[PDB]
């Protein structure tokens with residue numbers, strides 16, 4: 001799997017389950033084209049977004065729908081979403097894990113990139 | 116100052132100096148319209164972005180140009196930029212500080228909302 | 231102020247007010263000896279912990295009493311406290327700010343070392 | 346596995362490999378007794394520290410030897426180690442993952458606690 005997303009909840013100390021994730025790829029006309037989407041599992045993970053064939057060199061945006069998640073838990077958070085924007089595969093094919101750790105007024109994101 | 120931005124460097128243990136910051140507001144036609152911008156100071160801070168008069172309720176995006184910062188340091192980074200997207204909500208006196216802590220393959224952002 | 235502590239609350243998007251902070255220095259017999267302490271202010275800050283004269287090179291521990299903070303808010307937390315352990319090193323004018331960002335099941339700490 | 350540690354490197358965007366981890370348990374005399382230790386794998390993970398039988402209710406400290414890690418990469422970091430102190434199993438047996446994300450002058454730690 002070349003692109004995986006993992007989301008964790010810093011309030012509950014749990015995976016963040018059923019979080020919507022949308023991936024976009026920047027097109028030649030500078031617009032963000034829909035690329036893939038899904039929801040995190042019971043483990044906070046989202047796999048199977050793309051294939052090595054389709055995940056070509058480009059600029060990608062991973063939008064994680066954090067506000068919808070918090071609101072479903074009774075919390076009015078600060079952010080609309082977390083957005084992770086990066087160039088992928090520009091020094092050859094890599095496997096990318098995009099991890100996010102969520103709180104109501106903060107989040108962090110890291111990437112783990114491997115061969 | 117209803118809106119301040121503060122950027123810190125987790126590699127050097129320092130303010131992140133001379134980082135470009137762009138603020139956008141969501142318009143009517145769902146377009147991100149430029150709103151304010153600047154470069155962080157020697158203290159990693161950016162003040163004077165807007166006024167209480169202009170900073171009305173709405174959806175805002177703060178783009179922090181992290182990739183160019185790391186390139187200036189000779190360090191290969193992951194993200195193109197950090198994007199912080201939020202709704203400004205009245206209901207009383209509020210000042211917003213958007214803080215970001217930067218590493219090459221990670222960032223963190225929090226909002227400190229006070230009065 | 232050669233040593234400041236700043237604590238922020240990632241759930242409320244606010245300074246973490248009235249948090250107990252204890253600082254220790256490593257002695258000769260490898261015992262943590264109390265050095266300084268206080269409670270964070272309304273701005274989440276704790277100043278006046280020590281003087282340039284007393285804050286010599288050595289190994290220091292800053293203990294931030296996070297569990298009691300979350301208990302005061304009625305929120306079940308994971309950690310007993312956050313502990314920040316570091317060597318203070320001269321070689322020129324240096325001021326240390328130990329920042330912490332708190333969530334119930336997570337914390338983050340950075341050092342901003344300036345002159 | 347009731348206790349797992351995962352460590353990631355925010356500079357390289359990689360697991361933090363070969364990081365020493367020491368676990369202590371607070372004894373009746375208020376002293377920290379050695380409990381378990383190991384080093385992170387190629388995946389940044391450390392499994393097999395303990396068993397459900399031996400991992401009883403108590404206050405535990407997980408010390409992650411971050412300074413040794415950074416120094417081996419040519420970096421002089423701020424912290425001596427990251428310390429994670431928590432009560433375990435005080436509302437019945439749980440599975441704990443202690444995750445840490447490391448930078449030279451910052452780290453974060455979260456816990457994922459499951460049934």
Ligand SMILES: O=C(O)c1ccccc1Nc1cc(Cl)c(OCCCCCCCOc2c(Cl)cc(Nc3ccccc3C(=O)O)cc2Cl)c(Cl)c1
Nearest residue numbers: 099100101108214215216223329331338339340444453455
């Ligand atoms: O990644 C995996 O693969 C993974 C998989 C499974 C499990 C775990 C996995 N890892 C993993 C682990 C973790 Cl801990 C993780 O979270 C990373 C959390 C990063 C913490 C956020 C850092 C907060 O920064 C700060 C801090 Cl300290 C202070 C401040 N304030 C100030 C500091 C100084 C001066 C002024 C201020 C201010 O405010 O005016 C602002 C910020 Cl912005 C992630 Cl995203 C993935």
